[PDB]
Write a protein that binds this ligand. Sequence first.
Ligand SMILES: [Zn+2]
Ligand SMILES: [Zn+2]
Ligand SMILES: [Zn+2]
Ligand SMILES: [Zn+2]
Ligand SMILES: [Zn+2]
Ligand SMILES: [Zn+2]
Lengths: 74, 76
Amino acid sequence: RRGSGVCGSVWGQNDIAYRCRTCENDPTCAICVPCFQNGDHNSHDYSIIYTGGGCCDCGDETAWKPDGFCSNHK
Amino acid sequence: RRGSGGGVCGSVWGQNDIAYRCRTCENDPTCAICVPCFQNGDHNSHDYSIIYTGGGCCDCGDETAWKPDGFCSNHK
Ligand SMILES: [Zn+2]
Ligand SMILES: [Zn+2]
Ligand SMILES: [Zn+2]
Ligand SMILES: [Zn+2]
Ligand SMILES: [Zn+2]
Ligand SMILES: [Zn+2]
């Protein structure tokens, strides 16, 4: 989308990333592995995802709760 | 957000870099795709414009922002 503090980092079709059902705005949202690990999802309902690729929504509050942002993306 | 078959593009523009808006394909007026994705897709008869503003990241491959009919050939 257009506009300018978001990861937006990108993974391929057979690259892993993370889904977190506690932090996501909806089921199409996801974050990269570095941003998941530098955040805290203890007790959240998260899974590793294997398919589809994506751009990291870490730092983007239309797609991800701010409580769920990693330490590098406020 | 996540891909749906052919992955996503996610390439990023700067403030004064151009890209394409397509009103036929967009989900809302903030969506946009990068020039390479526009060229490798089919928007004949669509109401598209070259846009010059504010930076962003390409939405090709993200079904929440762009009709899959309008995905480029490299994003399925
Ligand atoms: Zn990330
Ligand atoms: Zn992050
Ligand atoms: Zn979470
Ligand atoms: Zn179009
Ligand atoms: Zn693109
Ligand atoms: Zn594309």
